[PDB]
Amino acid sequence: HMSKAFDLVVIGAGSGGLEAGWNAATLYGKRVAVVDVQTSHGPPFYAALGGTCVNVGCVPKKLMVTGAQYMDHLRESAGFGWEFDGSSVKANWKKLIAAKNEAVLDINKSYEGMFNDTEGLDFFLGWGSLESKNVVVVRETADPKSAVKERLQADHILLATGSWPQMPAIPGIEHCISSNEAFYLPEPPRRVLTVGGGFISVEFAGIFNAYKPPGGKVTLCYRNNLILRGFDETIREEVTKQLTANGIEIMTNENPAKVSLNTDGSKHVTFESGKTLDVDVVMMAIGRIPRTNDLQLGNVGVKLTPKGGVQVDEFSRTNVPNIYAIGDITDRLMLTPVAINEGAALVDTVFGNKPRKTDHTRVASAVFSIPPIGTCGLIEEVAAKEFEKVAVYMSSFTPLMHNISGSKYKKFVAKIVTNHSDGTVLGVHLLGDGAPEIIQAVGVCLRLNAKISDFYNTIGVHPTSAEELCSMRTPSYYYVKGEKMEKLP
Amino acid sequence: SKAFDLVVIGAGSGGLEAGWNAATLYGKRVAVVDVQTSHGPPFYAALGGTCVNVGCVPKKLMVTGAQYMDHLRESAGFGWEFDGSSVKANWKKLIAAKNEAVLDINKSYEGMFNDTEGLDFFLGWGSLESKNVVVVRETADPKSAVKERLQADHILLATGSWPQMPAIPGIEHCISSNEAFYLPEPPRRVLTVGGGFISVEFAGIFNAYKPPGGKVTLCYRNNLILRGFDETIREEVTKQLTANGIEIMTNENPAKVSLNTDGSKHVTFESGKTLDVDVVMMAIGRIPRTNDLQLGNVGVKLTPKGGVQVDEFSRTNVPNIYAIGDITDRLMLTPVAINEGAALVDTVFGNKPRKTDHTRVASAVFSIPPIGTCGLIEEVAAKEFEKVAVYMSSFTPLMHNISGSKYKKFVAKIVTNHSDGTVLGVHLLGDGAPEIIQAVGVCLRLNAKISDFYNTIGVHPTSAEELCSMRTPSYYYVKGEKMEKLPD
Numbered sequence: 016h017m018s019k020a021f022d023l024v025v026i027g028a029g030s031g032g033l034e035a036g037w038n039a040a041t042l043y044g045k046r047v048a049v050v051d052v053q054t055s056h057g058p059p060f061y062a063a064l065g066g067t068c069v070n071v072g073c074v075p076k077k078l079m080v081t082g083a084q085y086m087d088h089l090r091e092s093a094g095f096g097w098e099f100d101g102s103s104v105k106a107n108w109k110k111l112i113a114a115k116n117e118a119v120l121d122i123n124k125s126y127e128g129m130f131n132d133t134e135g136l137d138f139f140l141g142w143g144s145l146e147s148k149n150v151v152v153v154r155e156t157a158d159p160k161s162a163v164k165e166r167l168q169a170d171h172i173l174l175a176t177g178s179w180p181q182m183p184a185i186p187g188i189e190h191c192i193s194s195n196e197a198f199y200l201p202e203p204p205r206r207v208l209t210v211g212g213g214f215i216s217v218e219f220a221g222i223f224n225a226y227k228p229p230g231g232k233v234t235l236c237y238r239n240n241l242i243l244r245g246f247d248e249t250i251r252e253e254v255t256k257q258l259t260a261n262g263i264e265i266m267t268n269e270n271p272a273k274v275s276l277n278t279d280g281s282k283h284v285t286f287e288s289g290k291t292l293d294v295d296v297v298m299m300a301i302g303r304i305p306r307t308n309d310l311q312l313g314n315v316g317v318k319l320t321p322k323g324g325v326q327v328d329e330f331s332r333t334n335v336p337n338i339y340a341i342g343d344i345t346d347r348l349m350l351t352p353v354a355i356n357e358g359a360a361l362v363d364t365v366f367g368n369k370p371r372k373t374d375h376t377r378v379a380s381a382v383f384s385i386p387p388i389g390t391c392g393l394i395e396e397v398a399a400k401e402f403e404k405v406a407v408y409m410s411s412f413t414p415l416m417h418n419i420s421g422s423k424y425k426k427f428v429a430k431i432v433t434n435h436s437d438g439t440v441l442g443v444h445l446l447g448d449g450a451p452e453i454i455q456a457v458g459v460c461l462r463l464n465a466k467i468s469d470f471y472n473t474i475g476v477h478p479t480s481a482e483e484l485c486s487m488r489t490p491s492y493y494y495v496k497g498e499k500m501e502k503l504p
Numbered sequence: 505s506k507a508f509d510l511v512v513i514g515a516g517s518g519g520l521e522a523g524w525n526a527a528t529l530y531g532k533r534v535a536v537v538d539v540q541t542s543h544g545p546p547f548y549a550a551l552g553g554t555c556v557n558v559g560c561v562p563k564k565l566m567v568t569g570a571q572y573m574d575h576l577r578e579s580a581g582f583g584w585e586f587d588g589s590s591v592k593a594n595w596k597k598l599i600a601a602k603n604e605a606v607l608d609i610n611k612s613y614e615g616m617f618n619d620t621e622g623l624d625f626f627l628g629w630g631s632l633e634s635k636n637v638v639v640v641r642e643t644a645d646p647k648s649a650v651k652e653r654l655q656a657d658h659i660l661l662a663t664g665s666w667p668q669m670p671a672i673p674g675i676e677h678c679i680s681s682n683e684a685f686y687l688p689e690p691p692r693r694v695l696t697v698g699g700g701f702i703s704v705e706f707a708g709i710f711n712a713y714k715p716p717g718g719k720v721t722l723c724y725r726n727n728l729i730l731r732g733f734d735e736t737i738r739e740e741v742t743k744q745l746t747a748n749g750i751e752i753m754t755n756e757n758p759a760k761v762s763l764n765t766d767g768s769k770h771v772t773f774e775s776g777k778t779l780d781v782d783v784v785m786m787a788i789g790r791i792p793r794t795n796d797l798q799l800g801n802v803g804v805k806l807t808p809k810g811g812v813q814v815d816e817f818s819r820t821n822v823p824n825i826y827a828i829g830d831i832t833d834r835l836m837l838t839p840v841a842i843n844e845g846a847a848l849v850d851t852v853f854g855n856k857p858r859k860t861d862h863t864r865v866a867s868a869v870f871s872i873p874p875i876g877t878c879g880l881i882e883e884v885a886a887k888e889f890e891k892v893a894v895y896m897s898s899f900t901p902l903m904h905n906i907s908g909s910k911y912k913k914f915v916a917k918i919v920t921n922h923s924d925g926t927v928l929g930v931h932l933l934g935d936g937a938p939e940i941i942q943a944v945g946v947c948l949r950l951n952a953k954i955s956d957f958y959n960t961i962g963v964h965p966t967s968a969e970e971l972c973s974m975r976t977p978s979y980y981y982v983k984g985e986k987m988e989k990l991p992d
């Protein structure tokens with residue numbers, strides 16, 4: 016065995032790394048190697064070829080939220096005349112997980128097939144780390160003493176290893192799981208606590224709520240007062256109400272202090288407040304941290320931020336020329352389309368003679384809660400710190416179809432935040448069925464510096480929820496040098 | 505006799521927007537005439553208009569109901585189990601919930617008239633007596649008892665449209681969409697006549713609520729349904745309706761209808777083919793509602809097609825008389841009528857000349873699955889521009905490989921002026937298409953280019969992100985001719 020040489024070696028065959036590698040090989044004719052620890056989804060390492068989104072992320076969770084939405088569909092169908100034997104209804108979690116596994120594995124195999132097929136784009140199985148500025152070592156395990164499978168020479172090295180769930184250091188943490196294990200639970204839990212106020216905790220609470228066996232209960236806890244920090248506050252409050260209305264118990268200002276096993280093997284959670292809760296599963300979803308430990312970055316001196324991500328400039332360059340980093344390892348916006356964008360921009364800059372930096376502002380994103388969130392741009396309290404005068408246009412109402420369906424608690428919320436001095440739309444925030452689909456073209460609008468008049472001048476599609484975005488002409492309230500008020504002074 | 509700044513004939517989408525804005529924004533004195541205070545037989549449309557009473561609002565509720573036939577079947581792929589043989593669709597419950605929702609809107613409009621200054625509602629049939637006088641009568645008969653005489657500085661004609669019925673023997677044994685909203689029972693066998701959105705939408709509604717053994721047939725006199733929409737989507741929606749059990753009869757047209765002894769209908773087509781159905785719903789067109797207005801009393805000119813002729817500011821040939829909405833026989837959409845009404849009042853009663861933009865109007869078809877579209881289809885663009893590019897994406901989404909509805913291909917197409925990348929049209933087929941397309945309408949008002957779409961970061965996982973992933977044209981039109989690659 017001799018070492019192999021490449022123009023670019025990518026560590027991590029995920030959302031950003033695969034985009035960069037495919038583009039460098041097929042668009043610019045470079046010789047590319049990509050390293051990942053596993054060729055298909057699941058234990059032991061959960062992520063695999065395709066990345067976190069494909070294997071234990073956006074793709075399987077969206078399939079599972081879609082399955083969970085049928086609990087609402089079956090019940091809501093009666094208002095429209097549908098009759099069937101309600102007593103016969105069962106939610107078969109094993110079938111859902113098996114269908115999901117097959118879909119994910121099909122993607123694994125297609126990525127595998129393209130590496131087999133594509134000239135100058137090679138896959139290597141193992142753990143990648145940095146030996147020197149131009150050599151990536153591939154070992155059998157994360158342990159730097161494990162056996163060497165390959166040495167990959169590289170003119171350019173891309174770090175794209177993603178992130179990993181954070182687990183708090185509490186007694187009994189070994190009795191708890193993360194989202195990785197949640198995707199493979201043999202049976203749906205009767206009682207489950209999801210710990211965290213972020214999108215992963217909220218989304219899984221909705222999944223477990225639909226598939227729980229008879230007499231089950233889903234509890235979400237969050238250590239601060241209101242879940243979903245960073246999202247629009249009206250939407251944060253409404254999502255809490257609508258989760259509660261669908262049977263999920265939301266414990267705010269509460270945080271686990273320890274977990275122990277009852278004699279029957281269930282989990283006994285004690286909170287810092289002294290409250291207790293018995294559940295069958297505790298899922299920790301308190302945050303995700305960049306995966307830097309195994310790369311041996313000390314060997315070449317790549318600088319990390321205080322937070323722990325790889326430090327990068329606007330062009331994804333580390334402090335070592337010829338070493339770059341994109342995606343969750345940079346510990347900024349942890350979204351699959353941002354990682355892909357960064358990968359494509361980096362490759363255009365390095366090999367394409369067309370420099371380009373990713374725009375991290377006005378990125379549209381979604382939460383697949385039930386019902387879901389779609390958002391793009393600034394929340395109003397952030398905008399009020401940066402702009403002298405901010406206007407907020409707001410529409411909130413239960414749609415007519417949900418006055419027939421029985422789900423009257425399902426208010427649709429649409430909000431537009433503007434710089435009132437010139438009308439520029441600073442942000443759009445949506446809650447309700449369809450919000451993730453509605454918000455995509457809003458992202459294009461904000462990239463084009465749309466003003467509130469551009470929205471209002473556009474003729475609505477009727478009847479839709481989206482048309483509310485094009486029917487708002489008068490602010491609901493304002494911020495004036497940071498101060499909220501119904502009217503301008 | 506009573507004096508008014510504005511009299512509106514027709515309390516519909518456009519007429520209510522115009523009257524409400526004239527009163528509450530400019531302080532004018534406004535009278536609005538309609539023939540019925542709430543929905544249903546005998547005149548169907550009523551206070552609120554066609555959309556509220558027998559149009560967008562109830563049909564959307566009914567399409568939503570029909571979608572549950574798909575949801576119940578598709579839930580199984582995600583692990584949901586229940587007694588399939590116990591499922592039945594209760595049409596009477598559907599119609600009853602729809603009726604209550606519409607009536608609530610009627611009452612709501614009633615209270616708004618009662619609560620607003622300078623805004624009065626009059627029940628009955630309005631027609632022009634003289635250039636500044638509107639008469640309200642008991643029936644559509646111009647000899648029926650006069651109820652009011654309204655003198656007006658300004659007159660707005662906003663009476664909408666009405667279903668077109670072909671002149672064939674037995675047309676009297678057919679219904680229109682008006683009656684379809686009130687059928688006592690869901691038809692077991694039904695023929696919907698027409699290729700347009702109303703026929704296609706009701707075909708999906710009847711297909712879900714039909715009793716056991718039932719069958720929906722849609723017929724259309726030409727070769728491919730949904731003329732005026734994207735051709736790829738026309739073919740795809742044809743395929744997906746067929747996959748859900750609807751029979752599409754193209755190049756067929758009823759020649760006569762006769763009554764069977766059991767109450768069903770015997771349809772004979774021009775081709776000689778025959779079909780027995782319980783209901784024949786004619787949905788071949790809608791025509792401007794001009795006949796009861798006595799436009800000859802004042803000389804309001806019509807177009808050859810029967811619309812009231814208007815300029816870009818909604819003015820007729822008679823000074824002080826205006827027309828908006830379906831009566832002008834242009835884009836027959838509720839939000840266009842609302843836009844026209846508002847522009848009119850801003851022009852007349854404010855220092856604000858304003859004309860409605862009828863290009864790049866987003867719209868939808870609530871077929872199952874639905875369509876969302878905005879701007880030009882490629883063969884219309886190919887006549888207006890020397891170089892046109894078409895970007896195309898078409899696949900079955902992952903969820904429908906699991907649901908079992910593998911026929912549900914999502915289609916996304918972007919049409920550009922290839923000379924400068926300007927987006928001319930966007931056309932979508934699939935779950936969510938009407939919601940996705942709304943902000944595309946805003947994009948086209950910022951002269952968005954194809955590069956503006958693909959340089960935008962996607963929201964993942966969605967169908968909509970497909971619009972931000974298309975870099976390379978699938979094919980072109982050059983000087984009007986379709987070709988896979990460019991000449992240069």
Ligand SMILES: Cc1cc2nc3c(=O)[nH]c(=O)nc-3n(C[C@H](O)[C@H](O)[C@H](O)COP(=O)(O)OP(=O)(O)OC[C@H]3O[C@@H](n4cnc5c(N)ncnc54)[C@H](O)[C@@H]3O)c2cc1C
Nearest residue numbers: 027029030031066067072073143176177342343349350351
């Ligand atoms: C439960 C969940 C749901 C999510 N839902 C969404 C959503 O709806 N939308 C969205 O936009 N984002 C979502 N995300 C976020 C998205 O998954 C990430 O932002 C994205 O995958 C990050 O891409 P990346 O290229 O940084 O890394 P990843 O896609 O994580 O790829 C990194 C890869 O590196 C491999 N690797 C790690 N260390 C090594 C090593 N030393 N050697 C070799 N290989 C290594 C891993 O096996 C992995 O395959 C979700 C995340 C989670 C956890």
Ligand SMILES: Cc1cc2nc3c(=O)[nH]c(=O)nc-3n(C[C@H](O)[C@H](O)[C@H](O)COP(=O)(O)OP(=O)(O)OC[C@H]3O[C@@H](n4cnc5c(N)ncnc54)[C@H](O)[C@@H]3O)c2cc1C
Nearest residue numbers: 514516517518553554555559560630664829830836837838
């Ligand atoms: C089945 C169906 C579905 C539709 N779905 C949609 C959809 O999803 N989206 C969409 O945008 N559009 C839809 N439309 C079209 C929409 O309904 C019309 O474009 C819109 O209602 C027209 O508004 P308008 O102001 O011209 O008149 P209308 O809203 O039709 O109002 C006309 C009113 O005038 C009254 N009137 C008539 N003659 C007289 C008279 N002589 N005196 C007094 N009053 C009179 C009538 O009672 C009626 O209330 C649909 C139409 C139909 C038939």
Ligand SMILES: Cc1nccn1Cc1cccc(C#N)c1
Nearest residue numbers: 032033034036037049126129130
């Ligand atoms: C098919 C495709 N177009 C864009 C990205 N990809 C994904 C892909 C698949 C296999 C290897 C790589 C790398 N490296 C990337």
Ligand SMILES: Cc1nccn1Cc1cccc(C#N)c1
Nearest residue numbers: 519520521523524536613616617
């Ligand atoms: C409240 C409202 N804003 C816009 C339209 N409308 C509806 C409405 C109701 C009753 C009378 C009229 C008139 N004329 C209009």
Ligand SMILES: [Br-]
Nearest residue numbers: 106107108109
């Ligand atoms: Br199960």
Ligand SMILES: [Br-]
Nearest residue numbers: 726727728731
């Ligand atoms: Br045709």
